[PDB]
Nucleic acid binder design. Sequence first.
RNA 1: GGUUGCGGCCAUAUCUACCAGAAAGCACCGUUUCCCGUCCGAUCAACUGUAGUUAAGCUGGUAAGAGCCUGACCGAGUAGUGUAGUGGGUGACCAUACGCGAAACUCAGGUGCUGCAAUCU
Length: 169
Amino acid sequence: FKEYQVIGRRLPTESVPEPKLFRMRIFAPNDVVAKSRYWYFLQKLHKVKKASGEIVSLNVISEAHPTTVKNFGVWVRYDSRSGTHNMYKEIRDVTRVGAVESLYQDMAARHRARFRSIHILKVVELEKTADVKRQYVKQFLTKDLKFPLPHRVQKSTKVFAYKRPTTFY
RNA sequence: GGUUGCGGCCAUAUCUACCAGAAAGCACCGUUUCCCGUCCGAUCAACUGUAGUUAAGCUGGUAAGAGCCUGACCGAGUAGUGUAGUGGGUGACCAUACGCGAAACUCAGGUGCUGCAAUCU
């Protein structure tokens, strides 16, 4: 994934030139999917369609500080078999892109919700801990977090081995 | 501009209710010998433009009007739908992708225009 910015005009009509312009932080894998997802999200907010309209600018937004662990709040409208829900998941990730990648998996695992079902409504780095509502984020926001990785396992490149394996760590 | 004759598109011209109309024209309007037609000179026919009148018609104007039209990132890019999938879903159906795309609804504006001929403070 990447987080494309997509800006789009509509078109110019005689009588109304210089139209309003719009902008979306589309989390799309590439220029081409960006430009879909933008228009798919436009077509649900305005009376404009890729034909009667135009993209202005793709710009790939990069994470400002991409080696800092962040608590990303994300709101999601996802469509079930039955009915469509809102949500609010929180994701400890080092970028928006990684978060929103790893949300789509988390949605897919926990709700069988495919990428095409989910909308990413808003994404937000949460400044304060406390605003982190979910327990499963909160775990890792503890004063002096130490833990082990019990039951380590070794990928032997060979078939056999003689030493008889161990899970010490 | 008004009016008349013949008109074009055929309600932006229809309808409902209330006001205004100088000039001309229109009209209502008077008469029954003749042609003419009726149960009945009302209609139609003829005669006068004389006795009268804008009351009605006709025209124009008014109405948070009915209707009619036109438009709008008003609703709705919805509903629907053409194509695509070894997409979902027990299925019923649904979601997406490339496409086209309504109607009610909501608001705004409008409410005959116009041709030829003739005529009129």
